[PDB]
Amino acid sequence: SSSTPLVKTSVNYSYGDYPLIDADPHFKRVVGYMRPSDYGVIGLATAALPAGICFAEWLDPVKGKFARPSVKFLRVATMLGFAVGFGAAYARSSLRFFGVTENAREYKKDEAQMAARKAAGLEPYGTSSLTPELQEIAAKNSAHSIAGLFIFPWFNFVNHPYHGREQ
Amino acid sequence: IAHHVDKGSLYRLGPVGINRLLNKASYNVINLSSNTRSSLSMNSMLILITIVSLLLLVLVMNVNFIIVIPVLISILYILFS
Amino acid sequence: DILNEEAKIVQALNNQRELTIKMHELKREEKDYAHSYSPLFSDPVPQGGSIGKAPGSSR
Amino acid sequence: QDPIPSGALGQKVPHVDESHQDLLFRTSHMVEDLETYDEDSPINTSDANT
Amino acid sequence: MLILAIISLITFVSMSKLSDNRAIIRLINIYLILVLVLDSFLYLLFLNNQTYTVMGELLIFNSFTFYIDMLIYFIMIVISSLYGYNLYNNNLYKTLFEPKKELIILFLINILGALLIVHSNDFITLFVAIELQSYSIYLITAIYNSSYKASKASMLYFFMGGILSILIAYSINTYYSVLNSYTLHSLDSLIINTLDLNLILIALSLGLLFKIGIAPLHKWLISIYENTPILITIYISLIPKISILSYLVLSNISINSLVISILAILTLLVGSVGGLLQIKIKRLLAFSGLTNAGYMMLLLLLNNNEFSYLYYITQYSISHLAIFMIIIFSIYYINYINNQYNPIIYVNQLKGLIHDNAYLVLSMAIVVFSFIGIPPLLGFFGKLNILMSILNNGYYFISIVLIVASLISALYYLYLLNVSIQDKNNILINSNETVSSVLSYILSSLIILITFGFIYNSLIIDIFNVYFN
Amino acid sequence: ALFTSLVGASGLGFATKFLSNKIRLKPAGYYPLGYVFSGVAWAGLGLVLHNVHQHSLEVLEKKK
Amino acid sequence: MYLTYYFIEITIFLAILCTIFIISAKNPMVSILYMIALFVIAAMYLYLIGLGIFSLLYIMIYIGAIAVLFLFIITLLDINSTELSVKSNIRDLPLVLISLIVLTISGLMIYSNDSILINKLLEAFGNDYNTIITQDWFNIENTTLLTTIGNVLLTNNAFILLVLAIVLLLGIIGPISITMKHK
Amino acid sequence: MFIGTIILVLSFLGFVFNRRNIILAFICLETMLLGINLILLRNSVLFDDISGSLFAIVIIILAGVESAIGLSLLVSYYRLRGVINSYGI
Ligand SMILES: CCCCC/C=C/C/C=C/CCCCCCCC(=O)O[C@H](COC(=O)CCCCCCCCCCCCCCC)COP(=O)([O-])OCC[N+](C)(C)C
């Protein structure tokens, strides 16, 4: 009842050297586990877009003479830079769930958090307000969508029961 | 030999006959789309002939392959000359 | 001292020849459904379209 | 300023001056290549929407 | 991240003035650069040819498609730098090379439609994405609407794209009438034996291919490429080719195709002998696209063609992009500028180019010997690796016709050189204004990839061995 | 070697800056600091490509 | 009772007839009015087959938006037209007849899978067997057809609805961006 | 399949042999799209699925946006030339 996957699923099917954590991590868990180097990548991309526009005018200016770009463009450069930094951030942090980069830091967190949900007597991946067919369809939509991050942003917000793991 | 063979006939299989062959063939395939006043009706009737003619070729072709070789030689003759 | 440096190069080229013949065999080898389709959801079995579903429609 | 322009097969090709856009050159009969008289040039337009 | 760019962008362009348009494109240029740099690492997902299917049997993501994705972003970074940067600061070049307000909108919507084909598993994803990119080429053609030729070309392209969209749709529904299925994943090599899916899959392939410029129906595309202006046409030439071909190379539905083999022979013939006695540079330059799209139709007949394809893709894209960028630079040196949208047309207009900016002729030479297939250049290994796939797999008459077509097509390639290295009476001695540093660095970078890009052939193959096998 | 790949990719960058100066009808050493800029950029592309090839060889070693 | 049998065939004949008045009509907008009649014949066939939902979607969308757009164009724009003279299209008539025969037969060909070409065509005509409709009591709610479309456009193919939103966006942006003349 | 194939083929030949105006070419395109619809909707009814009806309801919208885009292309074509030719573009 709202916990049966009713599917057949690959089990611990590692995508690289290292063991997987999830087949798609929820958005909340990805934002929870990201490293300080990841917030550094976010800050790098927030700083790189307005500095990039001011640089690319200093190479060859628009009106023949060098002026600084208006604040109207620097505001949108900051916004789209935070967008690039967050996309790179989410993609980096989801790679560690898939086991394709080093995740020895995050794997201990997941031993601890899956052991804490067993002690608190609740579902291993969340009670969600969806029928199990809608959970399955919703996470067939959200499975492995970090590939194709170039075309479209897509994320996981459904608490569905399968993540490519035993028990 | 220095006139009728060396400069005469070895250039007709060489660079002086290939220029005339390619001149004629290119003139034909450029004037293939020449005649019509409207480009739209010409191209819209040229999309029809192909999906007609390709289909008829494949009808001829699964029966016997020998009877479709001269058809393609003649289509090349009419397209390029 | 020159015949040995012959043989080192010929060994290093027969290594590349065997490397190529292997990597050409590795392409035509068939591949699992978990590797050549989605890894998650490794079954091809559908169970698709379940709202007014009839028992006995499984096989 | 060549004596004879070339055309990749040794043919004679027209050198395109400003003098190819007149009324007799307008609406000639030809393939879409080797043709002068463009429809868009600042002597053929001549206040095209006024 | 194209979606976020489009959603942010069209709201942002609605509020900017006309004079801001140029600088907007500069922003988007840098945006796409940081989608290459800061987001490349997703190649780590695709080890050992691991393929993903995303959104539920809808989009297929392998690393073939990841490379096509990266190639399309790189060429857009180039094309966007061509619109967004001045050539010179004259009163002339401001009214010749000027972007419209909504130009970058249609650019990014077009790239979206071109990526949703190569990534596509379903047929309705295929159909919706072909329709999206077909609308975008309609509107990119018609956006410079104060031109007689561009409007006539947009109408011609509308009707000839409508026919070959309804032929694709008829082939999809014909395939559905015999199989309750949308994927070519259902085919799985047993069904093709006991089912006559020849005529269906071949008609689907054709209706996809005639939009490229395959040769029974090639005249209308050469007319659109001559009628459109000089900046619109380096985009609408490149994008439907690489998108539709890397769809059809990925899904192998025409193998032992006798019809694709006839049309490949006919393409290599009437492309090489088509563009011989021609005097307009975009014509000459658009029959080079017909032959080089002929070399792809060969690879459709192949099984396992992902090396020859991708290498010859990025070959043709760099060579393509460079030879169009060179004749942008020759416009300063011509003695006659007509036709504001299309300022250089006739190929004799670049005649004294060696006496004025001789290294533009060094550039032009290096890219045009690469179209011929000269071995120190990158075009030769592309033709070589096509030949290694053709001769492996039994296509022996196709190979010698390929060679004869390459030899005939070298003539009108070398006509560019013949015209360029000639005497001119009135040579330039000094120029006040010089060419854009960030924009001429792009042409220098595109040459040094063609010249010194045979270096990395070994490295690439080893990388090719890991991620696709 | 890692070092020769760096020096040669920086040489490719020096070639791009040279040819880009000389399309512009400038002298060779017109803006000398841009040689350093382009050389470090193309050297960084050499860094990236060399590290990707390292990792691909290390993946091929683990299949035995 | 058996007067209600040939309806489908009647619509086919009627639909055939309508197309000849589309391609041959002296006035343009009279032929576009015949096209509106052809949409009505299509919606008759779609009710007649069992799809009553679609028929009203055709009358809403095709007749009420696309045809209204077309008539609205023809009003305030200039279009020359020549009549169907015998002298200009009698040269077309033989390629018309050849293409009628070939395209008609070859459209009838791919519904069938014998290797022999003549067996492909005859299976097009062997339909006179009457399908038996059985009552199964397995469904408990009135999921109509439009409900199922709204379940599959929204869960299994939500991305196609979303790429479709990009297409509808493009259909807004495009006509505007052509016909602006900004400043 | 007879009604959809006959509408498609007759509309296709009426499109191809159009020399009289241009709005006949647009409406021959739209009647083609109707014919492809008819063939698919019948195949959905005979196969017991909404699947082809899914492709149908998408291609309805795409035929609509094709009309909107292309008729704005015609207004752009007409803007510079105050008359449309009878023989064609
Ligand atoms: C910090 C990130 C820097 C951003 C890099 C962005 C690059 C965009 C450019 C795309 C087109 C340019 C050609 C790139 C070739 C990548 C080869 C590769 O490796 O391709 C392989 C196989 O290729 C093929 O089939 C054949 C392609 C052959 C290319 C022919 C051109 C050769 C000359 C240019 C290459 C050498 C220049 C180096 C200069 C120092 C698979 O692709 P992959 O999945 O391994 O992608 C690698 C991920 N990389 C980009 C982040 C490292």
UniProtKB/TrEMBL annotation, chain A:
Domain called NADH-ubiquinone oxidoreductase 21kDa subunit C-terminal fungi: residue spans: 121-164
Alphabetical keyword list: Membrane, Transmembrane, Transmembrane helix, Ubiquinone
Cross-referenced Pfam families: NADH-u_ox-rdase (PF10785), NADH_u_ox_C (PF12853)
Segments passing through the bilayer: 39-59, 71-91
Record has tRNA-binding as a keyword: no
Boundaries of every NADH-ubiquinone oxidoreductase 21kDa subunit N-terminal domain copy: 17-102
The organism's place on the tree of life at top rank: Eukaryota
PANTHER family for this protein: NADH-UBIQUINONE OXIDOREDUCTASE 21KDA SUBUNIT N-TERMINAL DOMAIN-CONTAINING PROTEIN, OXIDOREDUCTASE 21 KDA SUBUNIT, PUTATIVE (AFU_ORTHOLOGUE AFUA_4G04750)-RELATED
Name under which the protein is recorded: NADH-ubiquinone oxidoreductase complex I, 21 kDa subunit-domain-containing protein
Source species: Yarrowia lipolytica
Automatic annotation (TrEMBL), chain D:
Family statement: Belongs to the complex I 49 kDa subunit family.
UniProt protein name: NUCM protein
Automatic annotation (TrEMBL), chain E:
Location, primary (coarse class): membrane
Catalytic activity: a ubiquinone + NADH + 5 H(+)(in) = a ubiquinol + NAD(+) + 4 H(+)(out)
Start and end residues of each NADH:quinone oxidoreductase/Mrp antiporter transmembrane domain: 120-409
Domain of life: Eukaryota
Membrane topology designation: Multi-pass membrane protein
UniProtKB keywords: Membrane, Mitochondrion, Oxidoreductase, Transmembrane, Transmembrane helix
Modified residues (N-formylmethionine): 1
Pfam short name (any one): Proton_antipo_M
A molecular function (GO) term: oxidoreductase activity
Species of origin: Yarrowia lipolytica (Candida lipolytica)
The EC number(s) this enzyme carries: 7.1.1.2
Family: Belongs to the complex I subunit 2 family.
Subcellular location: Membrane
Signal peptide: none
GO cellular component: membrane
Keyword Lipid biosynthesis: no
UniProt key word Mitochondrion: yes
Protein name: NADH-ubiquinone oxidoreductase chain 2
Membrane-spanning residues: 28-47, 59-83, 103-130, 156-178, 190-210, 230-249, 255-277, 284-303, 309-337, 358-382, 394-417, 438-461
TrEMBL record, chain F:
Protein name: Uncharacterized protein
